[PDB]
Symmetry: C2
Subunit: 317 residues, 2 copies
């Protein structure tokens, strides 16, 4: 949501960084559009109709920033890797949307997601087997996260479940953008590893911050019966507010009245601060990863995009 | 259907061929089961529940036969390639079945197909980029065939449509099994190419022969409004039977009475022989591909499986 969107539009204080990155984003956009519009007309018509004019694409932007740490920043294979990351993101969405007349739309969305994966594999064949191995792991995790969310927490700790879902569904692909951007630019192993880990931590920050904003400002997750981190923390409390929330939150909610009452209870609970402290813990991890990288305007741009996101909910926000 | 099933069980007249191939099929089965049962328990439970105890797997068997033409037949990478082909086949089915309560089964089938593709990519990362490039093309074609079948013939020639659907949905993956089995065994380029082309031709033969059997012996395709090659040929005829079929076959059929009457008209038409002559034309292509390969019991086993299939419907069948 707003986190991943706002992140793309945090201005770099470095005008050349800005220009180089912008130029490489156009090249990503060109190659991506070529892939999305490749194949038989009847298939391409479908894929183009599902293609939602986006704006700024955070995952490829992160891959391009990560490449600034290697000897060949923004090179042709960095652009191609960024496209692979973005195509995988889109394929993922198309399969997600089908799960979240109508018999036709579902068939075609499934197939649009599949042909995107075929396009991505074509490009990966030119990037090398290490990219393919990394893709296999990343994509397997993304699929695992979607299945995990689909089956639910079952008998596990609900906060561990929530954390695992976000790490798999969201973190791993941002981590992958850092890994691939840096690796294809020929960065040092430690720097590749640091950018990967930074992307994982930032993925967590984006989603938790979004979840906090959703509740503390509509509460649309609540209506669905989707209880995110602040709600799960509040449900754990041995307080009258915790008890009343446990009584009420047995499933999705129905009238503005019950939703509104729950949102009021949540604001009376310790759930917001508990979720925020978890955000801070990931921000500490993110800063520890950036410690591994050389000082530079690109390092600080990465930091700023994390920081700016935390500041949407953080102290004196 | 019966064609691809019966093909696996045409006895090789070569007892050692039989033993070597059987041993390698066990190794395929082991590695396949390992992949299908890899990942988080909640995901593996789902994949195992969808895994339909099969029997004999034609596509990997064909890859193993094809490998008999190279310097390293049945080697570890031949086994691994055969597994990749079979996993792709299964993924394809899972996405097909969702298109051909219920909201849950669809979600999980989509995700089972996706995690299979992630497993396949893991193995391909060890097989090399040429395998990945070939996979990208093959899988893109398979997906194109499914989309083509989904959108329908639109304004194109219905027989060209039917032919394109079978070539893409079925032929390309059998062709891929021949290509990969031979390539990973280190066969000569001409032999790799011949086995690929032979697999494409055999895929056509299997499906047309199945379609003939369905009509000329229930007629279950007809009820669905699925008109296969013999029906499409009969619909083209400038005869009273062609005219009456054009009048009747405007969509799916409903009572045993109309279906039965159509099946009788089809038996009075020239549609069976026209479809059979198309089978013979692919059998000529298949024989021309085998001409490119050295004489051997494996060559004749490949021939026999084609021939045996044609003989299910062919002259004096």
């Amino acid at each position: 949501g707003v986190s991943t969107t706002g992140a793309s539009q945090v201005e770099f204080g470095d005008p050349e960084l800005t220009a180089r990155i912008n130029d490489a984003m156009v090249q990503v956009e060109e190659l991506l559009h070529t892939e999305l519009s490749s194949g038989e007309d009847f298939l391409v018509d479908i894929v183009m109709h599902l293609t939602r004019a986006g704006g700024k694409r955070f995952r490829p932007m992160f891959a391009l920033l990560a490449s600034e740490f290697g000897e060949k920043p923004l090179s042709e294979n960095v652009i191609k890797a960024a496209v692979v990351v973005e195509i995988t993101h889109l394929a993922t969405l198309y399969h997600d949307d089908v799960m979240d007349n109508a018999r036709w739309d579902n068939s075609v969305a499934i197939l649009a997601g599949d042909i995107l994966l075929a396009h991505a594999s074509g490009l990966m064949s030119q990037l090398g087997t290490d990219t393919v191995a990394h893709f296999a792991e990343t994509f397997g995790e993304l699929v695992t996260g979607q299945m995990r969310e689909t089956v639910g927490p079952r008998d596990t700790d609900p906060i561990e479940h929530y954390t695992n879902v976000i790490r798999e569904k969201t973190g791993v692909l941002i981590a992958s953008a850092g890994y691939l951007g840096a690796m294809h630019a020929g960065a040092a192993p430690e720097h590749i590893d640091a950018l990967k880990n930074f992307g994982a931590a930032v993925g967590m920050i984006f989603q938790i911050v979004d979840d906090i904003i959703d509740i503390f400002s509509p509460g649309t997750d609540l209506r669905e019966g989707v209880f995110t981190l602040p709600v799960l923390y509040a449900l754990r409390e041995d307080t009258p507010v915790g008890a009343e929330l446990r009584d009420i939150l047995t499933g999705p909610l129905e009238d503005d009245e019950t939703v509104n009452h729950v949102l009021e209870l949540l604001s009376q609970s310790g759930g917001r601060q508990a979720a925020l402290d978890e955000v801070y813990r990931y921000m500490d991890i993110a800063n520890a990863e950036l410690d591994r990288l050389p000082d530079s305007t690109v390092k600080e741009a990465l930091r700023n995009l994390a920081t700016f996101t935390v500041k949407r909910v953080g102290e004196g926000h």
